[PDB]
Amino acid sequence: EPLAAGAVILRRFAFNAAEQLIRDINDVASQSPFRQMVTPGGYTMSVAMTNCGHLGWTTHRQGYLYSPIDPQTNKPWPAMPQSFHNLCQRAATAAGYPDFQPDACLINRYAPGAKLSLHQDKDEPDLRAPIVSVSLGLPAIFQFGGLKRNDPLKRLLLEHGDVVVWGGESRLFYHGIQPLKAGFHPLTIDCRYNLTFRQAGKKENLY
Ligand SMILES: [Fe+2]
């Protein structure tokens, strides 16, 4: 029996691909800079973000959505790097999702003390498609609950190279990241990067 129904934890799965993945995060950031987006309550997120791929998650007039254009540059988000595409496919396939074809990758950067409040990934057209998570750099405590608010939370440390394929029931769980502890990592220096691959466009975009 699993810790999270439908989730597939692949520890250190991206450990070897880590250095290249980071070079690509930096490349993506040179075009679409990391920016701290504004929350519903008007607060600035402590986590900094950016996207790559055809679609990118962002804020838009009191709402949140996937856009083919970066509002900060008025240009498309950078294309999905080969390292990203490859790693995701290998993880998705190993987890039993060979047809998963993400068109969006939200890149999160956590500086010491950065955290992500509880939320569900429900902005995607088809929730049967999983979300592949890739952690890099400083370790973080990932928390997840259930399908509804105020449900009992479970914690899980996510470390450098860890990949989790959130499929099945786990795909809809409320989740977040507790305040990042300060520290040092050879490849990221003083932060943690997290990539979350999503199939954000409707199936028609595949034809
Ligand atoms: Fe999320």
From Swiss-Prot:
Under InterPro entries, the record lists:
Alkb (IPR004574), AlkB-like (IPR027450), AlkB-like_sf (IPR037151), Oxoglu/Fe-dep_dioxygenase_dom (IPR005123)
Entry GO terms, CC: cytoplasm; cytosol
What EC number(s) has UniProt assigned to this enzyme? 1.14.11.33
Q: How is the cofactor bound?
A: Binds 1 Fe(2+) ion per subunit.
Gene (name only)? alkB
Q: Top EC class per UniProt?
A: oxidoreductase
Record-annotated residues binding substrate? 57, 64-66, 123, 149
> Which Gene3D superfamilies does the record associate with it?
Alpha-ketoglutarate-dependent dioxygenase AlkB-like
In alphabetical order, the GO MF annotations are: broad specificity oxidative DNA demethylase activity; dioxygenase activity; ferrous iron binding; oxidative RNA demethylase activity
Give the species.
Escherichia coli (strain K12)
The role this protein plays is:
Dioxygenase that repairs alkylated DNA and RNA containing 3-methylcytosine or 1-methyladenine by oxidative demethylation. Has highest activity towards 3-methylcytosine. Has lower activity towards alkylated DNA containing ethenoadenine, and no detectable activity towards 1-methylguanine or 3-methylthymine. Accepts double-stranded and single-stranded substrates. Requires molecular oxygen, alpha-ketoglutarate and iron. Provides extensive resistance to alkylating agents such as MMS and DMS (SN2 agents), but not to MMNG and MNU (SN1 agents).
Q: What is this protein called?
A: Alpha-ketoglutarate-dependent dioxygenase AlkB
The record's PROSITE patterns line, in alphabetical order, gives: FE2OG_OXY
Residues annotated to bind 2-oxoglutarate:
108-110, 192-198
The UniProt family comment states: Belongs to the alkB family.
Presence of the UniProt keyword Oxidoreductase in the record? yes
Q: Which GO terms describe its biological process?
A: DNA alkylation repair; DNA repair; oxidative demethylation; oxidative RNA demethylation; response to methyl methanesulfonate; RNA repair
Provide the effect of residue 39 to A: Slightly reduced activity towards single-stranded DNA containing 1-methyladenine. Reduces affinity for undamaged DNA
